Scaffold this active site. Structure first.
Site, short mmCIF file in Angstrom:
data_model
loop_
_atom_site.label_atom_id
_atom_site.label_comp_id
_atom_site.label_asym_id
_atom_site.label_seq_id
_atom_site.Cartn_x
_atom_site.Cartn_y
_atom_site.Cartn_z
N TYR A 44 0.85 -1.20 0.00
CA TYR A 44 0.00 0.00 0.00
C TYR A 44 0.88 1.24 0.00
O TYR A 44 0.36 2.35 -0.17
CB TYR A 44 -0.97 0.08 1.18
CG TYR A 44 -1.92 -1.08 1.29
CD1 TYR A 44 -2.08 -2.00 0.27
CD2 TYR A 44 -2.68 -1.27 2.44
CE1 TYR A 44 -2.96 -3.08 0.35
CE2 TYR A 44 -3.55 -2.34 2.53
CZ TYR A 44 -3.70 -3.24 1.50
OH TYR A 44 -4.57 -4.29 1.64
N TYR A 49 3.37 -5.21 -9.78
CA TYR A 49 2.52 -5.82 -10.81
C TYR A 49 3.35 -6.02 -12.09
O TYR A 49 3.27 -5.19 -12.99
CB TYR A 49 1.30 -4.96 -11.09
CG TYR A 49 0.56 -4.46 -9.86
CD1 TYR A 49 0.79 -3.19 -9.35
CD2 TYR A 49 -0.36 -5.26 -9.19
CE1 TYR A 49 0.12 -2.72 -8.23
CE2 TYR A 49 -1.03 -4.80 -8.07
CZ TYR A 49 -0.79 -3.53 -7.60
OH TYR A 49 -1.46 -3.07 -6.48
N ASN A 105 -8.02 -13.77 0.27
CA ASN A 105 -8.52 -14.08 -1.06
C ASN A 105 -8.29 -15.56 -1.37
O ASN A 105 -8.03 -15.87 -2.53
CB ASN A 105 -7.82 -13.23 -2.10
CG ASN A 105 -8.14 -11.75 -1.90
OD1 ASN A 105 -9.32 -11.41 -1.97
ND2 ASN A 105 -7.14 -10.92 -1.65
N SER A 122 -13.00 -4.42 2.22
CA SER A 122 -14.03 -3.60 1.56
C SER A 122 -15.40 -3.74 2.20
O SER A 122 -16.40 -3.99 1.51
CB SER A 122 -14.06 -3.98 0.08
OG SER A 122 -12.77 -3.82 -0.49
N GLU A 139 -14.05 12.65 10.45
CA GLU A 139 -15.44 12.44 10.82
C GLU A 139 -15.91 11.02 10.53
O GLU A 139 -16.64 10.43 11.33
CB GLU A 139 -16.37 13.38 10.03
CG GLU A 139 -16.53 14.76 10.63
CD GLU A 139 -15.39 15.21 11.50
OE1 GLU A 139 -15.46 14.96 12.72
OE2 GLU A 139 -14.44 15.83 10.95
N1 LIG Z 1 -6.37 -8.18 1.37
C1 LIG Z 1 -6.88 -7.71 0.24
O1 LIG Z 1 -6.81 -8.22 -0.88
C2 LIG Z 1 -7.62 -6.39 0.36
C3 LIG Z 1 -8.22 -5.77 -0.79
C4 LIG Z 1 -8.92 -4.52 -0.66
C5 LIG Z 1 -8.99 -3.95 0.62
N2 LIG Z 1 -8.37 -4.60 1.79
C6 LIG Z 1 -8.17 -3.92 3.12
O2 LIG Z 1 -9.49 -3.60 3.59
C7 LIG Z 1 -9.62 -2.15 3.79
C8 LIG Z 1 -11.02 -1.78 3.47
O3 LIG Z 1 -11.49 -1.73 2.13
P1 LIG Z 1 -11.43 -0.77 1.04
O4 LIG Z 1 -10.50 0.35 1.47
O5 LIG Z 1 -11.26 -1.33 -0.22
O6 LIG Z 1 -12.84 -0.30 1.25
P2 LIG Z 1 -14.07 0.11 2.09
O7 LIG Z 1 -13.49 0.18 3.49
O8 LIG Z 1 -15.14 -0.77 1.87
O9 LIG Z 1 -14.50 1.64 1.65
C9 LIG Z 1 -13.76 2.67 1.71
C10 LIG Z 1 -14.27 3.89 0.87
O10 LIG Z 1 -15.31 4.34 1.65
C11 LIG Z 1 -15.19 5.71 2.07
N3 LIG Z 1 -15.80 5.74 3.38
C12 LIG Z 1 -15.24 5.31 4.56
N4 LIG Z 1 -16.12 5.42 5.60
C13 LIG Z 1 -17.24 5.95 5.00
C14 LIG Z 1 -18.45 6.32 5.62
N5 LIG Z 1 -18.82 6.24 6.88
N6 LIG Z 1 -19.45 6.85 4.73
C15 LIG Z 1 -19.22 6.96 3.39
N7 LIG Z 1 -18.04 6.65 2.81
C16 LIG Z 1 -17.01 6.12 3.66
C17 LIG Z 1 -13.70 5.96 2.01
O11 LIG Z 1 -13.47 7.38 1.79
P3 LIG Z 1 -12.76 8.28 2.95
O12 LIG Z 1 -11.38 7.74 3.23
O13 LIG Z 1 -12.68 9.68 2.33
O14 LIG Z 1 -13.67 8.20 4.18
C18 LIG Z 1 -13.28 5.09 0.84
O15 LIG Z 1 -13.49 5.74 -0.40
C19 LIG Z 1 -8.48 -1.59 2.86
O16 LIG Z 1 -8.14 -0.18 3.14
C20 LIG Z 1 -7.37 -2.63 3.10
O17 LIG Z 1 -6.80 -2.32 4.41
C21 LIG Z 1 -7.69 -5.81 1.64
C1 LIG Z 2 -4.54 -4.24 -3.04
C2 LIG Z 2 -4.90 -4.30 -4.53
C3 LIG Z 2 -4.83 -2.91 -5.16
C4 LIG Z 2 -5.94 -2.01 -4.57
C5 LIG Z 2 -7.35 -2.63 -4.78
C6 LIG Z 2 -7.43 -4.07 -4.21
C7 LIG Z 2 -8.78 -4.68 -4.61
C8 LIG Z 2 -9.96 -3.80 -4.17
C9 LIG Z 2 -9.85 -2.36 -4.50
C10 LIG Z 2 -10.97 -1.60 -4.63
C11 LIG Z 2 -10.92 -0.23 -5.11
O1 LIG Z 2 -11.95 0.39 -5.44
C12 LIG Z 2 -9.65 0.52 -4.86
C13 LIG Z 2 -8.45 -0.39 -5.12
C14 LIG Z 2 -8.49 -1.68 -4.27
C15 LIG Z 2 -8.38 -1.40 -2.77
C16 LIG Z 2 -6.30 -4.89 -4.83
C17 LIG Z 2 -6.18 -6.38 -4.48
C18 LIG Z 2 -4.71 -6.73 -4.74
C19 LIG Z 2 -4.04 -5.40 -5.20
O2 LIG Z 2 -2.67 -5.38 -4.80
#
Ligand SMILES: NC(=O)c1ccc[n+]([C@@H]2O[C@H](COP(=O)([O-])OP(=O)(O)OC[C@H]3O[C@@H](n4cnc5c(N)ncnc54)[C@H](OP(=O)(O)O)[C@@H]3O)[C@@H](O)[C@H]2O)c1
Ligand SMILES: C[C@]12CC[C@H]3[C@@H](CCC4=CC(=O)CC[C@@]43C)[C@@H]1CC[C@@H]2O
Length: 325
Positions: free
Chosen positions: A57, A131, A169, A219, A277
């Site tokens: 990240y 990548y 995953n 997510s 917030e």
């Molecule tokens: N292991 C994997 O393959 C993988 C893949 C994807 C994600 N993840 C992890 O999971 C975390 C979470 O998922 P994600 O970042 O993809 O998505 P997410 O947490 O589902 O959504 C985040 C999006 O929502 C907004 N947001 C946050 N709180 C909100 C609220 N209360 N109301 C409206 N919008 C809100 C954020 O904007 P703001 O920041 O402006 O609030 C951002 O654009 C990642 O940051 C990462 O740590 C892991």
């Molecule tokens: C972390 C990642 C790049 C960022 C991706 C993540 C999958 C989900 C995704 C949703 C988005 O809308 C923002 C980018 C992210 C957060 C991908 C899975 C493997 C890749 O390395």
């Protein structure tokens, strides 16, 4: 049950995990430097005790900055904080696993991580590129060997560099590959996968529960909907009519209802926000609960359609999403 003060659930190896954490992925070119550090600090001040991050990240050093500052001022002890880091696809060669973890420890400037997970089941060409692809844009893959990668992960736990080991995953087959391993020392304790009311993972959750594996919902708010990774024709989770109407009923936002839903079912959630917030809003999920009828109605939103299909890697031998779970 769960409270702001107290909301850790057990892991099968005797450790525990806070059932909400702060996600830290942010678009590297579109994110100000220091936004991650600040957000981690604010989250800890708010009450979060779990941070989810990854070397790839590009901001793990900010995560470490913030955690270390809060420990130095006595806000938390090291033991009160749970950091999850991840082993990316280009680092699956067994000889590379511990040096890769060691790099993350040095970046964080910490002695151990609480949870270290295989980031995806696919292996890509080891390189200085996250990548890797040829000039022709063809993806530069590497042959996987999840069992040998896992063995290297086990060695990191034996050395004390990580408390708990897990995966991300992974489908049922890939989980079984590890779980059926001859000479398995440490079972995975967690599988981090997409999870939320439009993709509730009912079968993968029941399978993990069968093996005492806790699901972590990445997510959990439906993603930031970047068109590179998500189909932005799919309707936005947070516009759902039921989730919004239940939000009205509780004077909560759809986001809060979605987060409460997953934690109430024992699924860890790691919503990302770098907005002060919304970081606070997302943690205010312990002062109400959903009724069983509500819980059923929300699970009923399950489309069995994912936002994150990773379609660009669908040809990789270890692509996890061809199988039904
Ligand atoms: N292991 C994997 O393959 C993988 C893949 C994807 C994600 N993840 C992890 O999971 C975390 C979470 O998922 P994600 O970042 O993809 O998505 P997410 O947490 O589902 O959504 C985040 C999006 O929502 C907004 N947001 C946050 N709180 C909100 C609220 N209360 N109301 C409206 N919008 C809100 C954020 O904007 P703001 O920041 O402006 O609030 C951002 O654009 C990642 O940051 C990462 O740590 C892991
Ligand atoms: C972390 C990642 C790049 C960022 C991706 C993540 C999958 C989900 C995704 C949703 C988005 O809308 C923002 C980018 C992210 C957060 C991908 C899975 C493997 C890749 O390395």
């Amino acid at each position: 049950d769960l409270s702001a003060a107290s909301h850790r659930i057990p892991l099968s190896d005797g450790n525990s995990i806070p059932i909400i954490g702060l996600g830290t992925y942010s678009e590297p070119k579109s994110t100000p430097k220091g936004a991650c550090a600040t957000s981690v600090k604010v989250a800890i001040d708010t009450g979060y005790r779990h941070i989810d991050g990854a070397y790839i990240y590009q901001n793990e050093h900010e995560v470490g900055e913030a955690i270390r500052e809060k420990i130095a001022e006595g806000k938390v002890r090291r033991e009160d904080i749970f950091y999850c880091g991840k082993l990316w696809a280009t680092n699956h060669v067994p000889e590379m696993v511990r040096p890769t973890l060691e790099r993350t420890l040095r970046v964080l400037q910490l002695d151990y991580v609480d949870l270290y997970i295989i980031e995806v089941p696919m292996a890509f060409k080891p390189g200085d590129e996250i990548y890797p692809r040829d000039e022709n844009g063809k993806w530069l893959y590497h042959k996987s060997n999840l069992c040998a990668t896992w063995e290297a992960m086990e060695a990191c736990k034996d050395a004390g560099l990580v408390k708990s080991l897990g995966v991300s995953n992974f489908n049922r087959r890939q989980l079984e590959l590890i779980l059926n391993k001859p000479g398995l020392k440490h079972k995975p304790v967690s599988n981090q996968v997409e999870c939320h009311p439009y993709f509730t993972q009912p079968k993968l959750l029941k399978f993990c529960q069968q093996h005492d594996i806790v699901i972590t919902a990445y997510s959990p708010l439906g993603t930031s909907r970047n068109p590179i990774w998500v189909n932005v024709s799919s309707p936005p989770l947070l516009k759902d009519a039921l989730l919004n109407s239940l939000g009205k009923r509780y004077n909560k936002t759809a986001a809060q209802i979605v987060l409460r839903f997953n934690i109430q079912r024992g699924v860890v959630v790691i919503p990302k926000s770098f907005n002060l917030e919304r970081i606070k809003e997302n943690f205010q999920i312990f002062d109400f609960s959903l009724t069983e009828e509500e819980m059923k109605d929300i699970e009923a939103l399950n489309k069995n359609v994912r936002f994150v299909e990773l379609l660009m890697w669908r040809d990789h031998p270890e692509y996890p999403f061809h199988d039904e779970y």
